[PDB]
Amino acid sequence: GFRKMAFPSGKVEGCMVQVTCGTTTLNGLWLDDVVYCPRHVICTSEDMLNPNYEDLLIRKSNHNFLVQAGNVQLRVIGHSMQNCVLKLKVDTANPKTPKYKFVRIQPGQTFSVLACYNGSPSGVYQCAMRPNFTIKGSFLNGSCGSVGFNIDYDCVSFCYMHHMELPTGVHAGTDLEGNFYGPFVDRQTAQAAGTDTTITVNVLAWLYAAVINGDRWFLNRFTTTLNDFNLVAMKYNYEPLTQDHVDILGPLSAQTGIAVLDMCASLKELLQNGMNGRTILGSALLEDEFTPFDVVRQC
Amino acid sequence: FRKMAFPSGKVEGCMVQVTCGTTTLNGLWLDDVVYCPRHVICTSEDMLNPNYEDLLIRKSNHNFLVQAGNVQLRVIGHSMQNCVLKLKVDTANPKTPKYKFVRIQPGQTFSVLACYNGSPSGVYQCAMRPNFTIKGSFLNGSCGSVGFNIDYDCVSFCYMHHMELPTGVHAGTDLEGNFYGPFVDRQTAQAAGTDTTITVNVLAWLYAAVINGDRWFLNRFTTTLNDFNLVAMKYNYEPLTQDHVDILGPLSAQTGIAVLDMCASLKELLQNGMNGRTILGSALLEDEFTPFDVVRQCS
Ligand SMILES: *[C@H](O)[C@H](C[C@@H]1CCNC1=O)NC(=O)[C@H](CC(C)C)NC(=O)OC[C@@H]1CCC(=O)N1CC1CCCCC1
């Protein structure tokens, strides 16, 4: 079968803590003797509108940060700021700290989100970095400091920390160096994203998945050149397909006996005609948050 | 609205592998018992037509290889309860959570922690279909993977994976070994009944749309539960039970829309169609979000 699947979240759960400053509580990520969290926790209502973070931060003491791991309070023995992430040095090391790395993902890549509130894990789901550097998440008040991640063997690669919601209801955040994905800023203002586009290489991965699971009504006998497909793709605000994308799709191509450019001819027909009421893998819409690797691992 | 799974860490800490000869699947290690599908004791050729009691009497504790990772847990006792094997082991699982075993109803959702060789690979949310199948994602070696809900700190185990049906859906038991539906653990052709739409979950979805301001479909009329059930069955929708009416209670109260009034609105959508409109950004009515799922994502 075929399902939007997240990585098992245990290794990350054992890192989550609650961080409080003033009347603001959000989540932190406790790795070794450091807790990472969004810097906008240090803001008041008034601050949030135009926070001079270097200025606000210097006025805080270690003791203004309350960090709790369950019942236990952790003692902050130092604080600093790296871009939009606050780093809290604590007197004790997290024994549940996994093998980890910090990475910056590219748009079109997917990752798992462990949504937390008051330092407690609440749910896990799979998301993609949109081409306009938003993510379509499920994040409520208190969710800031929730992280996104991938797991390779025994290693957790952290790629996202959550900071904000935009008026359209999508979400924005940073990598674990504190740099935003996209043109956003951690200030309480209405911010719009660039126009989004659909992740074409992922739509093609998902069409291959629908074939692998016996769903092929959208196929056709026609074919297309790469550039002629890309011309139509861009017309419909789909990302153009690169030769690296073609190559990445090979295993799915091999496994199903459907040349990539044949699948592109199928997608072009769907873009131009629509789904005629039909569904693919249950969906009325072309799904673009499965990468080729996601589909491969799972089939 | 996304399908959101529960954080899987409390369950990851209970997964082991169970091997008889070369047949390896997953087991669930709680306190000093390991629970797994009984067909682990069957050779490939045994599965064609197994005699489980006879296969079991021939077995001894020392024919069972139970491993957490690569660490052996010695089996000191074995019994069969319906279609699950219970293996008493000489070590109480230090990671055992607060837990219980529950048998869920069609329509209820749970998270599945897909595992291979006792290693978690992925977590996703499933609904139990009215025909007592789940639309899972399971490969060879996945049996013994479990489905669960988490309430506060208590893990309620409701599913253990045993088999795949011709249509590519999946079937299994509760943790007492009792199959959901009319299936048996024999490698013989079996077929799921025709599936129906989960009415209580569609209703939850409509409540979700209203909570978010999308309420064009509300009408000025009501209906009896009996009239609705009779009409719904003509559209291959499940009849509502009293338990369904009850679990819609909070969403009814949150919106001020009586359950039976929402039923009349759904009847009108069934009889007259969407007339080209959308609800929550979709022309399809969604049926795998329960009233709890809606609450846990809106509030
Ligand atoms: C345990 O890991 C395994 C999990 C399976 C295999 C891959 N995906 C799964 O979900 N379970 C079995 O192999 C199971 C063992 C039996 C003792 C129950 N047998 C099984 O799943 O296949 C037999 C099924 C039973 C109904 C049926 O018609 N059938 C034949 C195939 C035909 C092709 C499509 C799938 C069903």
Side-chain angles (χ1 to χ4, degrees), chain A residues 1-45 47 49-70 72 74 76-95 97-98 100 102-151 155-220 223-275 277 279-292 294-296 298-299, chain B residues 1-2 4-47 49-57 59-73 75-97 99 101-150 153-185 187-219 221-233 235-274 276-299:
Chain A
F2 188 75
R3 298 301 308 244
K4 192 168 274 175
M5 203 171 295
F7 287 107
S9 57
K11 302 192 156 53
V12 179
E13 295 169 44
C15 297
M16 300 309 301
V17 303
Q18 180 197 66
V19 178
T20 304
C21 182
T23 76
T24 303
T25 303
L26 43 67
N27 310 280
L29 183 74
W30 179 23
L31 299 168
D32 295 316
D33 57 7
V34 179
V35 171
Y36 304 77
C37 74
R39 69 183 179 175
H40 75 242
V41 66
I42 67 173
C43 288
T44 81
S45 124
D47 284 328
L49 183 51
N50 190 30
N52 188 324
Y53 284 111
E54 284 276 41
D55 202 53
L56 303 176
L57 182 55
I58 199 90
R59 304 179 192 263
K60 301 282 180 307
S61 307
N62 292 335
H63 67 74
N64 291 340
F65 300 109
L66 308 201
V67 177
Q68 308 206 89
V72 177
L74 308 176
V76 182
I77 63 177
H79 66 256
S80 61
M81 165 160 96
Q82 181 176 3
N83 300 306
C84 302
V85 294
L86 183 66
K87 305 200 272 206
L88 296 176
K89 179 79 79 53
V90 291
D91 55 15
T92 178
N94 185 355
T97 300
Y100 70 97
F102 289 170
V103 301
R104 196 174 169 87
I105 55 164
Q106 308 295 299
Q109 293 193 269
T110 56
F111 57 95
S112 293
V113 169
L114 178 67
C116 304
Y117 299 93
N118 293 288
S120 302
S122 35
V124 52
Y125 53 93
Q126 194 82 348
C127 278
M129 185 53 62
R130 307 301 310 165
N132 67 351
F133 289 107
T134 68
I135 72 175
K136 306 167 184 289
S138 300
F139 285 126
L140 308 174
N141 263 310
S143 63
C144 287
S146 295
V147 298
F149 59 101
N150 285 278
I151 309 185
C155 187
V156 179
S157 292
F158 293 102
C159 61
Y160 180 83
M161 181 170 273
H162 180 56
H163 291 247
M164 60 194 299
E165 192 167 309
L166 312 189
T168 64
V170 302
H171 300 101
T174 67
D175 64 25
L176 268 299
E177 289 178 55
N179 291 134
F180 268 87
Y181 296 101
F184 311 103
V185 183
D186 49 340
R187 67 153 62 157
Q188 192 76 14
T189 62
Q191 301 171 49
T195 56
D196 207 10
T197 53
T198 301
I199 308 159
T200 307
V201 64
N202 293 0
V203 173
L204 293 169
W206 177 76
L207 293 181
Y208 276 114
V211 168
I212 295 171
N213 285 267
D215 203 345
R216 3 165 76 230
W217 67 259
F218 50 84
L219 297 182
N220 65 34
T223 192
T224 180
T225 69
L226 178 62
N227 180 74
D228 290 334
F229 168 82
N230 278 341
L231 281 172
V232 172
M234 291 176 299
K235 185 188 178 184
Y236 290 79
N237 260 311
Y238 273 55
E239 291 287 281
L241 196 69
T242 67
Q243 182 63 41
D244 303 308
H245 293 163
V246 182
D247 292 331
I248 294 149
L249 281 173
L252 294 172
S253 193
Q255 180 175 348
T256 60
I258 305 182
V260 174
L261 292 180
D262 281 0
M263 197 58 89
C264 286
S266 283
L267 174 52
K268 185 198 290 181
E269 179 174 43
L270 288 170
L271 290 182
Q272 296 188 140
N273 307 339
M275 294 181 53
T279 69
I280 305 163
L281 284 173
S283 179
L285 298 171
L286 306 182
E287 178 54 52
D288 76 335
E289 303 201 352
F290 295 93
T291 68
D294 298 346
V295 169
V296 157
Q298 176 175 170
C299 294
Chain B
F1 286 97
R2 325 188 103 267
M4 201 171 309
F6 288 100
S8 57
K10 290 186 156 90
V11 180
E12 288 162 62
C14 302
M15 298 313 303
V16 297
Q17 52 191 316
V18 178
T19 294
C20 282
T22 57
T23 305
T24 293
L25 35 64
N26 307 281
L28 186 72
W29 180 19
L30 305 162
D31 292 314
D32 63 350
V33 183
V34 171
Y35 303 81
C36 72
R38 65 178 181 176
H39 72 246
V40 64
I41 68 182
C42 294
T43 67
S44 60
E45 194 65 12
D46 284 319
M47 291 166 186
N49 179 27
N51 176 5
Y52 281 106
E53 294 82 22
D54 175 285
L55 289 175
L56 188 59
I57 299 266
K59 284 283 205 137
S60 306
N61 297 320
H62 64 254
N63 300 133
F64 295 97
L65 174 53
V66 174
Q67 303 167 290
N70 282 326
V71 179
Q72 183 172 3
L73 298 181
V75 174
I76 63 179
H78 59 288
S79 72
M80 175 166 63
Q81 176 176 16
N82 301 307
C83 302
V84 300
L85 204 61
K86 300 191 279 190
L87 303 177
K88 193 95 156 163
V89 296
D90 68 355
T91 306
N93 182 1
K95 302 171 192 310
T96 302
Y99 73 93
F101 293 169
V102 318
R103 186 169 177 82
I104 55 165
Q105 315 173 334
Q108 290 193 253
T109 56
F110 51 97
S111 297
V112 170
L113 176 63
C115 294
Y116 298 93
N117 300 298
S119 215
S121 58
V123 63
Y124 56 87
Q125 194 88 331
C126 278
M128 175 64 69
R129 299 308 304 181
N131 66 2
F132 291 111
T133 73
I134 65 171
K135 298 202 182 86
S137 176
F138 288 121
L139 309 182
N140 291 334
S142 65
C143 286
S145 300
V146 294
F148 62 99
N149 286 285
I150 306 185
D153 63 329
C154 184
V155 182
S156 289
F157 294 105
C158 61
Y159 182 77
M160 180 169 277
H161 183 47
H162 293 238
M163 62 191 274
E164 183 170 280
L165 293 170
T167 58
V169 299
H170 302 100
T173 69
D174 64 18
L175 267 297
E176 298 190 321
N178 285 319
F179 260 92
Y180 291 97
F183 308 102
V184 301
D185 47 353
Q187 185 89 23
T188 192
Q190 304 165 60
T194 91
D195 201 22
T196 47
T197 300
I198 307 165
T199 306
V200 63
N201 291 353
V202 169
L203 290 167
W205 184 249
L206 301 177
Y207 277 109
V210 169
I211 286 165
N212 281 280
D214 197 358
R215 38 173 202 271
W216 61 265
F217 51 84
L218 294 176
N219 70 14
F221 299 119
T222 192
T223 181
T224 64
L225 190 53
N226 186 245
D227 284 317
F228 177 76
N229 277 358
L230 293 170
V231 172
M233 282 187 333
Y235 293 87
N236 270 271
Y237 272 54
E238 270 309 297
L240 298 163
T241 69
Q242 188 58 40
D243 285 351
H244 293 157
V245 172
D246 292 346
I247 66 172
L248 285 163
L251 290 170
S252 185
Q254 177 177 347
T255 60
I257 299 179
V259 169
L260 286 175
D261 295 3
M262 193 63 89
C263 290
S265 294
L266 179 53
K267 179 200 286 210
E268 191 182 309
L269 293 180
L270 290 184
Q271 294 184 143
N272 308 130
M274 300 277 272
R277 306 203 55 173
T278 53
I279 295 178
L280 282 170
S282 188
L284 297 203
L285 299 181
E286 170 70 45
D287 80 341
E288 295 213 343
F289 287 104
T290 74
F292 176 73
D293 291 313
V294 165
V295 148
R296 134 175 206 235
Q297 254 181 78
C298 292
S299 297

